[PDB]
């Protein structure tokens, strides 16, 4: 599973710097020991505050306020390739930001075989307007007159007596 | 002496031999009631639901 | 021994009660709160002698 964590932190204050700045991140992590490890990863590449200098101040979970409402998420990904160069924008349709990034990882694990550390997610925004959705298939599950038969049907205990209906 | 290693978690006699407090624990004290108040600041909820 | 135990048992709560309290203040205030750090650690081996 996944659990989105709000993380903020700073460095140790010195006499030269009495008040360090505070930096907020909204990232995803299956537990909290990897959040406060990924947090020092992003902040080291951007703010150059090393792990031997900074400290962690607050970790909290962000449960989705409306998990019962369908939504569509536009997903900004910086992907670290074998050449280490990919900015990616991808849309997913589901209910929860926790659930989207799981599907984001899964698709990204198939077509582009991305690992854990090979991905640094950049920004996640609940895209709302229908004219901004830039994908054909996501658009088609959003027309009022949608319909389809069931796919992947299959309706122990081997040796069935009669033929399955499969209808 | 001490032929068997008795377990003071699963034996309820050696536990009282080692710990003379098992006659008063009250592990579950009702320190709250219906009147629990919400303590969620506005500026914390603003920095929570930011982005 | 129980007189020492009663002191200890109520103290474990009285330090667990305050980190319930001292976070209920800051989170309702907008303040932040680093905790009393781990000072004990417990190390369990994972690999053999080979």
């Amino acid at each position: 599973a996944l659990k989105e964590y709000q993380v903020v932190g700073r460095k140790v204050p010195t006499e030269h710097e009495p008040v360090p700045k505070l930096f907020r991140m909204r990232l995803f992590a299956p537990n909290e020991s990897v959040a406060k490890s990924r947090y020092w990863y992003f902040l080291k590449m951007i703010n150059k505050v090393k792990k031997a200098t900074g400290e962690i101040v607050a970790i909290n979970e962000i449960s989705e306020p409306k998990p019962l409402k369908a939504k569509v998420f536009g997903i900004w990904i910086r992907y670290d390739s074998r050449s280490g160069t990919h900015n990616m924008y991808k849309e997913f349709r589901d209910t929860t930001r926790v659930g989207a990034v799981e599907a984001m990882y899964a698709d990204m694990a198939a077509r582009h075989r991305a690992r854990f550390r090979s991905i640094r997610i950049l920004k996640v925004v609940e895209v709302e307007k229908k004219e901004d959705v830039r994908r054909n298939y996501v658009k088609q599950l959003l027309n009022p007159h949608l319909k389809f038969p069931l796919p992947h049907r299959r309706t122990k205990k081997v040796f069935a007596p009669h033929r399955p209906s499969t209808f | 002496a001490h032929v068997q290693k008795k377990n003071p978690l699963k034996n309820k006699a050696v536990l009282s031999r080692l710990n003379p407090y098992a006659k008063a624990y009250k592990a579950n004290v009702k320190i709250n009631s219906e009147k629990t108040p919400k303590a969620a600041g506005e500026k914390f909820l603003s920095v929570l639901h930011e982005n | 021994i129980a007189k020492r135990a009663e002191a200890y048992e109520a103290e474990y709560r009285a330090a667990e009660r305050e980190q319930i309290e001292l976070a209920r203040k800051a989170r309702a205030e907008g303040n932040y709160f680093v905790p009393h750090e781990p000072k004990l650690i417990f190390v369990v081996r994972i690999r053999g002698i080979n």
């Binding site: 700073r10 505070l22 930096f23 991140m25 990232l27 951007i46 101040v57 | 920095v47 | -």
Partner: peptide, 23 residues
Amino acid sequence: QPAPPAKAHFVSTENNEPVTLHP
């Protein structure tokens, strides 16, 4: 004798609001 590690403390944010970054 060792220098002890750090106990707890508040840190107020009235003059230092946590900014949101992106990787």
